[PDB]
RNA sequence: GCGCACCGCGCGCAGGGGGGCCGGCGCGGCAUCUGGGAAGACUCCUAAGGCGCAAGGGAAUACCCCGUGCGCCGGGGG
């Protein structure tokens, strides 16, 4: 990932970074996706997944 | 009411002046780097009383100005609500001493 | 709830209001042939439908929803004819509707009265309402402001001539408007004429008798002789 | 036209009217062009609402200049007579402007309202 | 066979988008609705993809956009979180009409969510929702004429024949 | 390789690495007429006197960045040489206005910042009487 | 007492209880907009004791983003007396008077403005101050003043518009030197009043970063303005 | 990596980087739900009476009580 900033306390020293999304595709906002899934299953609950298992 | 407003205006201007003076007497800064190597280089480069009294004085002055201001603001609001309890028809606003809110649902025809 | 409802003058349909406000109120149309659901008109609003009235033929019905929207929603087409606005009143509370030789494709009723929350009560004409394309801002025939609180009864002499409109919240808010001249009366009701806190009015079918009633629960009656 | 912070969004306008009405019951609201301009010059104001459909618009075009200077938000409703009987005076106010105090839920509503206006910008 | 281009106007998260249909010949544009509200308008002319501007944003901050479809050339329809269907004119960018839906009286969570909107080729608008209804909005005055109950749970997608005769609902 | 340049004073051509030719002009109200003329893209006597070569279109090109002036001087039939628009001729036009120091003694060994500011004042006066007061 | 600041053309007047920013007045004896001014002479005039020569217009943090950033601690202005700076959004022609005082006559400042009243007092100030030239045009069309503007060195940009990045980009591409300087104001409320202002500031940083500048530094102007960032960046270097 | 044991692990200390992202803090959202304000004028708005303004007298004297003058609302009645 990206290097975290080094603050002197007054200012901040960070490194620019755009070497992540080169020509492939942008990574999603996990938050936004979970929001969508929330809006889908607003209140409702899942059934048991499969069968006889710990 | 008119008198109160004038003095309020003057003191408002004075708080403006004093605020300006206080500020000019006295995560904020971002410095960017291509790489952590130049970050470290800048780190190496960075490794390479009268004000207090006058600012404390300034601060006490501007705080006092704010207090007088707010008292004048309260005076303006208070006389506005006496106005509401002295309009020629039943009019909204201001508390009674019994605690209720006066709230007439009328319209001034 | 089935609190509010109004029946067609044709006497076949009945309109109930759905107590579910949420951005827009709807009123169901129920045949009194068989007390069955047959239609559900939905209007936009911000709280739902203040009041409504059956057009005099019966074919459509006018829905005055709060924040002053007026839908006119047909029955034979059973889709909304048109939308327009009371001239900028904050919250409509009552409407009603009457008169004769208004435009037939809006059912043929003539004067339409709309009463605000703020107390101002407008009177419009529907032959003026047409621009099927509707005038989105009828400059109102008149904008009556004798009253000063929220209008509760707005009703019509069923021969399309007198208008009664009256606020309940203050003692004796009942004013009487002659039509089509749209001038409010002077000689009635006076300072000493016993109305009360008017809560419901009704003229006769012959429109010779007026009856009025107030928060004590008492009825008064007046002959209407011109 | 010139009324470039137009607010036609219906629920937005209804919230503005209702806030004005509440503020009219709290005496924290000034009714009329001249008084609006007085309030902003004296700086006490915190939001100002005008009306788009005046016939010479120019009698209110002077307000946005001052409020751009002294930095308070302004926004246009489309209906003057709606604004007027929203105040509750029966005559079509063309300019209303409502100010701040110390501790009021109404002050909070004002802050959210000006946030909505800055959204509309 | 990889990403040609990217483009990003500053807003929340884009959720629904479509291009303006034809009525100019070479000036055609993307319209994208996003989380926070703001209709963004993107420009694609001659192998370009760039954020042109923001049409408008909705008043409140909780008005989430989920569905988008075009009634005509200049007339966009968005279906949105607080039970609403906004008809915007794009050209000026104004709000032609706010359609509105009621409470989902089966489950809780009052605010219904329009999930998918399209427009029929003769201009009416059809909208699958969260109570699984399907609304027929008359499109001239942008209001309802029918409320069909289709699924049990919520609609997830609509599709239409191109002559305007077969509507498919997916729940 | 015919280029169309235009400063506050005149034009130049650099068809042959180094410059080829130029034409200068100073101190008139036909300057601000030329300003409106390049605002729209219309006929300019300076423009016509430049494009009036006598042989032919020897290469069908006149590089000028703006598409409106390009497709207007297409519409002029006075020489019927065809321009090309800004086909990302940014290195081109940016570099010639940056390396314009070499151009100054070539045609006008002087400074014309005074006439440029006179132009800006005149046209801004035209704009604030366009929005009069 | 006046001393030139670390930044050249700039001066600081220090007394017992105050520290002010000031510039050398290009037109001494005249105040543009009711600014203060101090006259100081050079020493060598003892028996006379009249401060004649240098006139310093007192500049204000609460009217001007540029030296607002300087007093915030801007390390480099990229400009000097003798520079070429294009002004974007010459609001009421005051800071542009200041930067014209900085650049002197040998420096030439070109100011653009779109609003007409600001343009009126713009040209009215420009009638006095010569080293500025005004262009009343919407800078979203730079191809109208391309005839008027030569190549420059520094771009100052404060324009309250949504496509601030786009305007400054096309204008730089049309006029900025290789390795050019850019001082630019971002007003997060003007851009988007919704996201966290730091986030959207970083967003415009990325926008100029892909717009082929090099973001040198970025400061918040909040002893002075609210939700305002000054960004110093270099172009192609 | 320094001093302590050169017949040893280890300890006192400087800090380089990355990690469990274990646990807290901060910021954002959040279809629901709790709570609280404001709130619909059919809804409560203290009751057949309030309330204000100024005076006058009396006080645990920061606080309040009390019936002289002007207004403003209300009920009853009509």
From Swiss-Prot, chain B:
What is the protein name for this chain? U3 small nucleolar RNA-associated protein 11
Q: What pairs make up the disulfide bonds?
A: none
Give the top-rank taxon of the lineage listed in the UniProt record for this protein: Eukaryota
Q: Where is the composition biased (Basic and acidic residues)?
A: 36-48
Per UniProt, subcellular location reads as: Nucleus, Nucleolus
Write out the similarity annotation. Belongs to the UTP11 family.
Q: From start to end residue, where is composition biased (Basic residues)?
A: 98-109
């Amino acid at each position: 990932k990206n290097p975290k900033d080094k603050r002197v306390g007054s200012t901040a020293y960070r490194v620019v970074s755009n070497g992540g999304d080169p020509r492939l595709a942008p990574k999603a906002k996990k938050q936004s996706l979970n929001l969508k899934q929330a809006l889908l299953r607003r209140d409702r609950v899942a059934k048991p997944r499969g069968g006889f298992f710990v | 009411l008119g008198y109160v407003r004038t003095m309020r205006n003057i003191a408002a201007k004075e708080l403006k002046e004093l605020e300006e003076r206080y500020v000019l007497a006295g995560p904020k800064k971002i410095v960017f780097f291509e790489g952590v190597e130049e970050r470290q280089q800048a780190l190496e480069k960075q490794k390479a009383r009268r004000k207090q009294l006058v600012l404390e004085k300034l601060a006490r002055k501007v705080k006092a100005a704010r207090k007088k201001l707010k008292a004048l603001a309260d005076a303006e609001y208070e006389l506005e609500l006496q106005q509401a309890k002295m309009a020629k028809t039943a009019t909204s606003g201001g508390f009674t001493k019994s605690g209720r809110r006066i709230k007439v649902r009328e319209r001034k025809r | 709830t089935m609190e509010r409802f109004r029946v067609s003058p044709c006497g076949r349909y009945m309109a109930l209001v759905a107590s579910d406000k949420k951005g827009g109120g709807m009123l169901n149309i129920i045949n009194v042939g068989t007390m069955q659901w047959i239609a559900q008109a939905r209007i936009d609003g911000r709280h739902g439908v203040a009041d409504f009235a059956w057009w005099s033929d019966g074919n459509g019905l006018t829905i005055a929803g709060r924040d002053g929207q007026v839908t006119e929603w047909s029955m034979i087409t059973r889709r909304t004819v048109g939308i327009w606005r009371d001239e900028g009143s904050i919250g409509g509370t009552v409407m009603a509707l009457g008169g004769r030789n208004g435009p037939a494709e809006l059912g043929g009723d003539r004067w339409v009265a709309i009463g605000s929350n703020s107390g101002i009560l407008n009177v419009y004409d529907r032959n003026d309402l047409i621009e099927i394309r509707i005038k989105k801002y009828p400059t109102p025939t008149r904008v009556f402001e004798q009253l000063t609180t929220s209008i509760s009864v707005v009703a019509f002499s069923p021969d399309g001539q007198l208008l009664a409109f009256g606020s309940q919240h203050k003692k004796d808010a009942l004013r009487l408007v002659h039509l089509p001249s749209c001038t409010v009366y002077r000689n009635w009701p006076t300072e000493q004429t016993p109305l009360g806190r008017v809560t419901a009015i009704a003229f006769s079918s012959k429109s010779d008798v007026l009856a009025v009633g107030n928060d004590v629960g008492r009825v008064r009656l007046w002959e209407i002789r011109g | 036209s010139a009324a470039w912070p137009k607010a036609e969004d219906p629920a937005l306008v209804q919230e503005l009217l209702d806030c004005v009405q509440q503020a009219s019951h709290y005496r924290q609201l000034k009714k009329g062009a001249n008084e609006t301009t007085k309030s902003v010059n004296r700086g006490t104001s915190e939001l100002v609402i005008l009306a788009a459909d005046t016939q010479p618009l120019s009698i209110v075009l002077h307000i946005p200049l001052i409020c751009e200077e002294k930095n308070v938000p302004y926004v246009y409703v489309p209906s003057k007579v709606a604004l007027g009987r929203a105040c509750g005076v029966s005559r079509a106010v063309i300019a209303v402007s409502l100010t701040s105090n110390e501790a009021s839920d109404l002050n909070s509503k004002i802050r959210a309202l000006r946030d909505k206006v800055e959204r509309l910008a | 066979a990889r990403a040609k281009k990217h483009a990003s106007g500053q807003h929340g998260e884009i959720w629904c988008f479509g291009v303006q249909p034809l009525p100019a010949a070479q000036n055609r544009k993307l319209v994208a609705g996003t989380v926070d509200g703001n209709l963004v308008l993107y420009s694609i002319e001659d192998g370009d993809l760039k954020f042109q501007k923001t049409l408008t944003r909705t008043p409140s901050k909780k008005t989430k956009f989920v569905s988008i479809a075009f009634q005509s050339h200049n007339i966009v329809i968005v279906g949105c979180s607080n039970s609403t269907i906004c008809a915007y004119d794009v050209r000026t960018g104004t709000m032609l009409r706010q359609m509105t839906l009621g409470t989902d009286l089966t489950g809780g969570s009052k605010n219904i969510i329009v999930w998918a909107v399209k427009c029929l080729p003769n201009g009416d608008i059809v909208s699958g929702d969260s109570t699984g209804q399907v609304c027929i909005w008359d499109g001239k005055t942008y209001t309802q004429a029918q409320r069909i109950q289709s699924h049990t749970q919520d609609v997830l997608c609509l599709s239409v024949s191109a002559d305007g005769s077969k509507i498919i609902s997916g729940g | 390789l015919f280029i169309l340049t235009e400063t506050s004073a005149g034009y130049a051509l650099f068809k042959a690495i180094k410059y080829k030719e130029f034409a200068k002009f100073d101190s008139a109200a036909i300057a601000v007429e030329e300003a409106s003329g390049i605002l729209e893209g219309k006929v300019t006597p300076k423009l016509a006197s430049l494009l009036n070569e006598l042989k032919d279109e020897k290469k069908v090109t006149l590089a000028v960045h703006d598409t409106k002036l390009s497709n207007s001087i297409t519409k002029l039939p006075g020489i019927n040489i065809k321009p090309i628009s800004g086909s990302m001729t940014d290195d081109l036009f940016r570099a010639i206005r940056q390396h314009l120091y070499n151009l100054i003694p070539g045609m006008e060994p002087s400074n014309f910042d005074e006439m440029n500011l006179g132009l800006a004042h005149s046209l801004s006066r035209h704009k604030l009487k366009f929005s009069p007061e | 007492i006046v001393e030139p600041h670390r930044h050249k053309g700039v001066f600081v007047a220090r007394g017992g209880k105050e520290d002010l920013l000031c510039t050398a007045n290009l037109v001494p004896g005249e105040s543009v907009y009711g600014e203060k001014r101090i006259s100081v002479e050079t020493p060598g005039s003892g028996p006379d004791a009249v401060a004649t020569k240098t006139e310093y217009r007192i500049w204000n943090p609460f009217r001007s983003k540029l030296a607002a950033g300087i007093l915030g601690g801007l390390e480099t202005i990229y400009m000097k007396p003798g520079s070429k700076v294009l002004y974007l959004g010459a609001a009421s022609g005051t800071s542009v008077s200041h930067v014209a005082d900085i650049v002197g006559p040998t420096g030439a400042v070109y100011a653009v403005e779109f609003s007409h009243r600001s343009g009126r007092d713009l040209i009215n100030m420009a009638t006095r101050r010569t080293n500025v030239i005004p262009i009343v045009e919407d800078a979203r069309k730079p191809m109208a003043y391309r005839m008027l503007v030569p190549m420059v060195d520094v771009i100052f940009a404060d324009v309250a518009q949504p496509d601030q990045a786009r305007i400054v980009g096309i204008n730089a591409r049309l006029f900025l030197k290789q390795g050019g300087g850019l001082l630019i104001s971002i007003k997060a409320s003007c851009i988007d009043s919704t996201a966290p202002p730091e986030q959207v500031f970083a967003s415009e940083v990325q926008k100029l970063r892909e717009d082929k500048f090099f973001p040198k530094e970025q400061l918040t102007l909040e002893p002075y303005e609210r939700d305002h960032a000054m960004v110093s960046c270099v172009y192609l270097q």
